[PDB]
Structure formats: structure tokens, C-alpha cells
Scaffold this active site. Sequence first.
Site, mmCIF file in Angstrom:
data_model
loop_
_atom_site.group_PDB
_atom_site.id
_atom_site.type_symbol
_atom_site.label_atom_id
_atom_site.label_comp_id
_atom_site.label_asym_id
_atom_site.label_seq_id
_atom_site.Cartn_x
_atom_site.Cartn_y
_atom_site.Cartn_z
ATOM 1 C CE1 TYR A 28 -4.338 -1.146 -0.520
ATOM 2 C CE2 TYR A 28 -3.184 -3.063 0.368
ATOM 3 C CZ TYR A 28 -4.257 -2.525 -0.318
ATOM 4 O OH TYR A 28 -5.240 -3.372 -0.740
ATOM 5 N N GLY A 30 2.771 3.652 -1.533
ATOM 6 C CA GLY A 30 3.140 3.930 -2.928
ATOM 7 C C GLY A 30 1.885 4.196 -3.734
ATOM 8 N N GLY A 32 -1.414 3.819 -5.666
ATOM 9 C CA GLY A 32 -2.446 2.792 -5.567
ATOM 10 C C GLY A 32 -2.179 1.828 -4.408
ATOM 11 C CG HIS A 48 -2.028 8.110 3.949
ATOM 12 N ND1 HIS A 48 -1.260 8.373 2.850
ATOM 13 C CD2 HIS A 48 -2.252 9.337 4.577
ATOM 14 C CE1 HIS A 48 -1.028 9.694 2.776
ATOM 15 N NE2 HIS A 48 -1.645 10.290 3.823
ATOM 16 C CG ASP A 49 -3.300 4.008 -0.252
ATOM 17 O OD1 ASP A 49 -2.472 4.891 -0.001
ATOM 18 O OD2 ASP A 49 -3.007 3.030 -0.996
ATOM 19 C CE1 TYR A 52 -4.161 11.852 2.367
ATOM 20 C CE2 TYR A 52 -3.823 12.609 0.150
ATOM 21 C CZ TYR A 52 -3.511 12.673 1.496
ATOM 22 O OH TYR A 52 -2.548 13.546 1.977
ATOM 23 C CE1 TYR A 73 -0.598 19.429 6.297
ATOM 24 C CE2 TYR A 73 -2.018 18.329 4.835
ATOM 25 C CZ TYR A 73 -0.883 18.375 5.552
ATOM 26 O OH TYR A 73 -0.030 17.353 5.503
ATOM 27 C CG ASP A 99 -1.049 14.096 4.798
ATOM 28 O OD1 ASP A 99 -0.593 15.077 4.166
ATOM 29 O OD2 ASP A 99 -1.732 13.204 4.248
HETATM 30 O O1 NLA Z 1 1.139 8.159 -0.871
HETATM 31 C C1 NLA Z 1 1.754 7.783 -1.860
HETATM 32 O O2 NLA Z 1 1.195 7.671 -2.960
HETATM 33 C C2 NLA Z 1 3.221 7.468 -1.751
HETATM 34 C C3 NLA Z 1 3.840 7.529 -0.372
HETATM 35 C C4 NLA Z 1 3.428 6.697 0.620
HETATM 36 C C5 NLA Z 1 3.966 6.735 1.875
HETATM 37 C C6 NLA Z 1 4.978 7.601 2.203
HETATM 38 C C7 NLA Z 1 5.467 8.475 1.289
HETATM 39 C C8 NLA Z 1 6.457 9.343 1.606
HETATM 40 C C9 NLA Z 1 6.929 10.206 0.664
HETATM 41 C C10 NLA Z 1 6.434 10.222 -0.615
HETATM 42 C C11 NLA Z 1 5.429 9.354 -0.957
HETATM 43 C C12 NLA Z 1 4.926 8.470 -0.046
HETATM 44 CA CA CA Z 2 -5.258 24.381 0.695
HETATM 45 CA CA CA Z 3 -0.946 3.760 -1.708
#
Ligand code: NLA
Ligand code: CA
Ligand code: CA
Length: 124
Positions: A28, A30, A32, A48-49, A52, A73, A99
Site C-alpha cells: 500500500y 506507494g 495505488g 492512508h489510502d 484519501y 493545510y 497525513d
Molecule cells: O502516498 C503515496 O502515494 C506514496 C507515499 C506513501 C507513503 C509515504 C510516502 C512518503 C513520501 C512520498 C510518498 C509516499
Molecule cells: Ca489548501
Molecule cells: Ca498507496
Amino acid sequence: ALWQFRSMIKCAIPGSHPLMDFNNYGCYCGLGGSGTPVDELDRCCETHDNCYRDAKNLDSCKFLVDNPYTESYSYSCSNTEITCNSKNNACEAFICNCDRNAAICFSKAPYNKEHKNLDTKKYC
Ligand SMILES: O=C(O)Cc1cccc2ccccc12
Ligand SMILES: [Ca+2]
Ligand SMILES: [Ca+2]
């Protein structure tokens, strides 16, 4: 916004480099994601995904390019403490909390080297 999430991580985990450490980790962390997370850290990323996802589905928010990462923010960092500014509008607050919760989560998950750049076609 993306850059700010990078700085959140640096805040929660000071001895850290985010783009390198948490991008393409497990299934996860990265762009998608697929399958079941492998790890507690990977779970932090799936949540997190999903955060969002929920934000995109708040009909009161319309993010640029439809990407919540696009949205700034304000938030501050005081010795490992992330604080989301109360003055962020509802949508910015929501993203902000995605975040921040994710950086707090990353700071408590075991980092497993095994899973950096996982073969996702196979294991996810
Ligand atoms: O959320 C993403 O798509 C990628 C992603 C996931 C987790 C940590 C990260 C840190 C820096 C840059 C990208 C990052
Ligand atoms: Ca803003
Ligand atoms: Ca992801």
C-alpha cells in the site's frame, strides 16, 4: 499536500528519509495499492489510502486534479508532535489528519527491510 506529508514523517521520525523509506514499501505504501497489507507499516499506508478515498467522497470538497495531495493545510511540528492548525477548512483538516495519523502510525510500526520494494505482482 504531498510535500507536507513528507515533512510530517520527518517530524514524527526525525532520523528518517520518507521518499526513500516509505515509498514502494509493501503493498500500500506507494501509488495505488492491492491485496492485504503485509505489515503494520503497510497497514498504516492502506489506512492512508482509504483516508484519501473518504476525503475524495466528501461531496463538499473538490480537490484540484481530484487529488487530495494537491491540497495544503497548515500544521506545525514541535519535537515529534504534529499539530494540525484548527484554522484549516474542513477539507484541509481532513487531509491534514490523514497525513498526521499516518505519520504517527509510521512512527510506531515495525520497519521490515524484507518489504521495501516488495514483488507486488506476487505478494499483494
Ligand atoms: O502516498 C503515496 O502515494 C506514496 C507515499 C506513501 C507513503 C509515504 C510516502 C512518503 C513520501 C512520498 C510518498 C509516499
Ligand atoms: Ca489548501
Ligand atoms: Ca498507496
